[PDB]
Symmetry: D2
Subunit: 410 residues, 4 copies
């Protein structure tokens, strides 16, 4: 009995040889991308043999196993439908239907307050999926870079807890949400900000990351860390946006100085500096696709699904999904956790970084925001998703009414 | 082949005939209780043939088949380790350790608010587990009756969504927590109570159940409902507590009038009569055991696990688990939601109604309260549980560090 | 020299005999009403004399002195222009224009929450003046009985602090205003209602008066007190208003319950009767004329200006004038102090009971209210009054611009 | 007849010639100060004849003529007991008693957040009186200089309203006290600061004085005013304090940024520059004596009582006294208006600028502050002072019980 030869027949169709193309589409339909980091060695040995014998391009039992043995455990789970969503082909057809269903939601205003977002077209709309198993799908403008803005807040929160610990970080920032008209306060009853998803707390989380090092290396570190999360897909920086967020954050200066007077930063902080760090962190660039991996890294206990590398300690990822669930969507967090149940984070550029724990992570992007600050199509999507799929945090996996369960076969 | 036959060998140990007590001990080790209502036909036949043959006592292939023909589906998956917690014996040893660690935390004051909760001894402490499959276990003072008090708030809420739907019920009561010092207000900004787990929201929810009918038939309605949730285990009513909780609820009368003034009850409400129904529902008795089935019903999408009967819509069990999450523990709901992640509701008798969605329902009961209103041992047990098992709503099922996962074998 | 005779010459104007009306007119143009209690002996000896010798009807040095001697100090001051307003004849002209400019101010809604405030016409409008010397003037509808409503709040607080003293009284009630979105709260952080001009605090004041006797004598005591405050002018009761005010005070009961549960009342209170007692007090009836005398007892150190009797301790009248300055116009209290700078109390029936300390008291009444609860005309007239005369509480009495002073002669 | 002639006999006491020192002691017992700027011609001419005839030194009716013609009117009101306080020598014995009674109240903490306030001894304690007529008295450390700090707030508010009128000024700053625990919020519901006596309201006012000019001139403009209000007595400036005030003013900067974001300043407002100018205005020095004349200009309709000069518009002085009464004493403002009922303003250096309209103004200085911000001896002195005299805003000038009234005689 042999792992590679068995798989060779399950694709062989009883035929004596396997065309190369007939393998590459058989792969793409499990949800995997040929470019997958975990797959390169199987792909390099396809790049190899596609010059040696140009008179093929068939694969022996030998030649197949020549390419596939390095990555056979993960190749077999794909082909025996062990992936978390087994029939991935159907599910993306629903992601597409759900996409077009939101793509018609024309209302909302593009953030005007800096020119770099006022220049983005309200017509843009991309949705990118990434499972805890690397199965990927995209619809729309999913390769257009845009800023995280406050989609970075849980990411840097995860970074800080990962390095310093729950208990150190939660001397400096609370861990609840404030109250639907405690929106305007900075500090709770203990003179910490209310949670790391609000600007008072985020500006505080930022002063914890990589202390004793200067602000340009601090940035490189967070760039390094965000890189491991998206498994080395697009992570960028628009100096443009950064300039406008610098000239115009009289509010964050207001918050910052209140925090300084009231003694909430760690001993030896240079407040005005980390306002600059914080402005930088918000002008970090992502695509739909690359962030959906960051999102799937949270969905997977802190292990990147396209690389398998442990990026975040399981304490940081739990902590974060806990605070996305209740402080994640500005004043809509309450109604959002009720009707959707998924930890999410929004951003004024139009981002919505979505986790479905133990299934997949997402990124949805339409620049027009509603009157509370959330992507109009973004919100309309997440509702439609939970509507359709028993992905609500407090659905029941065994008795789930008429909703569809993508983890199940038939 | 034949199911009963195959199960027969699974227990036969290659022998020709199984002793009854061998069959019994094999059944109870799966955590099933022989008293199970899904098993009554199995037991009714064993009890009868161990009459019609004092000649024994020993079942042959065809004699064991007469007994288990009727409950075979459930007997098989009990023996084929197909329950949610497959190693139920090892899990209950864990519960006993957690219980016995909670049991050394003698802090807290019991509720002397009325002569009936001050009558309960501080040394009482009990935990009842009922899984979504029916596997019971308890240790401690698990058969003492105590009033639900505010542990009934999610139960009554669930019934009102179950009968009226989400839209109707949430015309009358909000969805979100209130804010760690908006605990003294009744209404939120739309002049609705903040959510169904606060006194003012519970009362308004009460005025939605089974309108037009007198308070007697209302009460019967809610009890015949609460019986189906507990699989017809103990659901009682204390009159001693009801008479106290009416001569001494000045503040619910305070809330009751503020609500009428602000036009929060449905048209044709009798406000004082509904305070009475309110005082009543709080005086309903459960034991630890009867209530762990109640919680278990919400852990199971609305189906009572020990009877298989559908007690609540999935839409009402979802809403209840969402609002228990965030608003379920008075002023500790934020800290609980962070450090525990399970839907939970607390009373002043010393109850804590616990749900692990898709796993089990629990009910812990120690009378003495901490300064926030919560059973001291209860809160200790619930932290101890989540540190041990990956049940925190935001643990990963795949990567979970030092924690045991009782959903798995080895 | 002699005091009766000198006076007699002053009004004689050198001629041998004074007619009867020529005196009565000379007396009225000082603003004393011929029916002043302190002139009875005089007016009596005048109605005696005006039957004896019908062949006059004129007096001489001897016979004038026969009538005026008993009342010669008061008659003289009036006639040597010693009264606080020397030229009271022009002052009432200005009070007429002020009344005409206000009856032009046609807006506002008459209170309709009960059928007894809604029956009144929106064109009823009256002002009544009464000085620290008893000079009287009225224009409009000043003898129409109407209901004090929250105008009674200072009058009972005065009775309260008169009988037991500032210190005792303020163990149950704060002494500031609360803040312009603190109006729905009942208690400050000491768990006392914020001041006696709010319904939370009024209700608590009410519990303090004549404790230990029943609600009939209690009301009688207050009635007797209010008689002495108005020099026995019209005071009454609307059993009509009191009935529909008790069937509708759901908030008032809401308050009463809250204060009970928070133990805001003195030992041995029957809360539900204090609300009955309080409802009654809010239906005490007055006219513009009678009530402006109550305000004149407040302007005058506690002595009723038309009887001479001490009715309130100079301690109680200060504390009340204090808390009408800051708390007496509901949410318009802040603006009203700023601009009018006079202590007033408004109530929902359309009355404004206004003090100009050390000068005069008023009552303005016109039932159409505005969107903070104040008589529209009554408000307008108040601004106009202080735009005219240096009566504003922080006006200079020596360097006061083009403002007009009725206390100065020329 | 001639004014100097008869004023001569009132001092002559029959004799042919008045000793000059006799005349002076008669003139100082009216509480006039021989330095008084309205008496300068008289004191020059006394010295000149004390030169031109050592031959003496005693004034016949004709040489006394030669000296007092210049300032005769002021001198006669002073010698004919026509001043606001006729018996000034008695009053000052009282002011000493109360001063000596506060001197025993040794509690509090000297403000030490900067080293220029910790520099002052806690046993420093001064009071200085100046009437509307320029009668003077001081006892204690009344020539020591100290910074106004928040005492400057009403002085600049008055400047801005005098220069701009009420309506314009109150576009940028409301006019009510916030509410006894909305002390941390910066703005009221209209996004204006609460009033001109809170650190945020003071700041925006500062932005309205003399817009369009640099800070050096703006300061020169403001100190022009102050010198006039104190009759050109000591007005100075601690640059040592302005330095420490700006280096430590994190919350003031926190405030300044917040106000810029909510567009609270006039267009074209340099926010950091307005902040500098704010720290300057707070570092302006006075002594008890010089600052008692500031206060007195407010008691006096805007006229400086010792120069006769018009400094502030009656509209400006009204609004400032109104806002001092309700907002001037930090969180003590509610209780201070109740129990003292005088327009007063405290500061962190220990001063309390105090006013009795139509009588006098004061400055009580003692560096130790209480837990609310107020001089321990200052608050003590004002309580004692008004228990003694009928100066409480709502005392009666006719029936004032056993209080002394320094405005009458026998
Ligand atoms: C928009 C909105 O929220 N309106 C309202 N919602 N709820 C309310 N409750 C009122 C009844 C009891 N409440 C008090 N609670 N605490 C109090 N005293 C202190 C010191 O806090 S009074 C006020 S008013
Ligand atoms: C209607 C309106 O204007 N509301 C507001 N006014 N000002 C605001 N700005 C915030 C910045 C400083 N503030 C804080 N003060 N205290 C805090 N912490 C605690 C425990 O209270 S945060 C408030 S929001």
């Amino acid at each position: 009995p042999s792992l590679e030869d068995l798989l060779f027949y399950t694709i062989a169709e009883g035929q004596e040889k396997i065309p190369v193309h007939k393998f590459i589409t058989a792969l793409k339909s499990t949800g995997l991308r040929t470019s997958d980091p975990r797959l390169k060695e199987c792909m390099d040995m396809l790049r190899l043999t596609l010059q040696t014998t140009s008179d093929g391009v068939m694969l022996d039992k030998d030649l197949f196993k020549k390419c596939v043995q390095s990555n056979i455990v993960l190749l077999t789970q794909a082909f025996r439908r062990k992936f978390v969503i087994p029939d991935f082909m159907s599910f993306t057809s629903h992601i597409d239907e759900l996409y077009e269903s939101a793509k018609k939601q024309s209302g909302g205003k593009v953030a005007d307050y800096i020119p770099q977002l006022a220049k983005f077209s309200p017509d843009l709309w991309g949705v990118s999926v990434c499972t805890a198993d690397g199965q990927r799908h995209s619809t729309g403008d999913t390769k257009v870079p845009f800023c995280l803005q406050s989609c970075v807040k849980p990411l840097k929160y995860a970074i800080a807890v990962n390095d310093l610990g729950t208990e150190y970080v939660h001397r400096y920032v609370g861990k609840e949400p404030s109250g639907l008209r405690f929106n305007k306060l900075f500090l709770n009853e203990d003179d910490k900000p209310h949670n790391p998803m609000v600007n008072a707390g985020a500006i505080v989380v930022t002063s914890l990351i990589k202390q004793g090092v200067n602000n340009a290396e601090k940035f490189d570190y967070v760039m390094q860390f965000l890189n491991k999360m998206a498994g080395n897909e697009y992570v960028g920086f628009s100096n443009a946006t950064f300039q406008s967020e610098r000239e115009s954050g009289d509010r964050n200066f207001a918050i910052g100085y209140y925090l300084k007077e009231k003694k909430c930063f760690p001993e030896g902080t240079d407040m005005v500096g980390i306002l600059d760090f914080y402005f930088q962190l918000c002008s970090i660039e992502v695509t739909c696709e690359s962030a959906s991996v960051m999102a799937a890294t949270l969905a997977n206990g802190g292990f990147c699904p396209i690389t398998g590398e442990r990026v975040l300690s399981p304490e940081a990822v739990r902590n974060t999904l806990s605070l996305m669930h209740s402080c994640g969507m500005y004043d809509f967090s309450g109604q959002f956790a009720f009707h959707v149940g998924l930890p999410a984070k929004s951003g004024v550029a139009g981002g919505i970084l979505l986790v479905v724990p133990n299934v997949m992570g997402m990124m949805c992007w339409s620049p027009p925001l509603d009157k509370m600050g959330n992507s109009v199509k973004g919100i309309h999507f997440c509702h439609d998703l939970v509507s359709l799929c028993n992905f609500h945090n407090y659905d029941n996996l065994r008795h789930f009414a008429k909703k569809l369960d993508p983890r199940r076969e038939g």
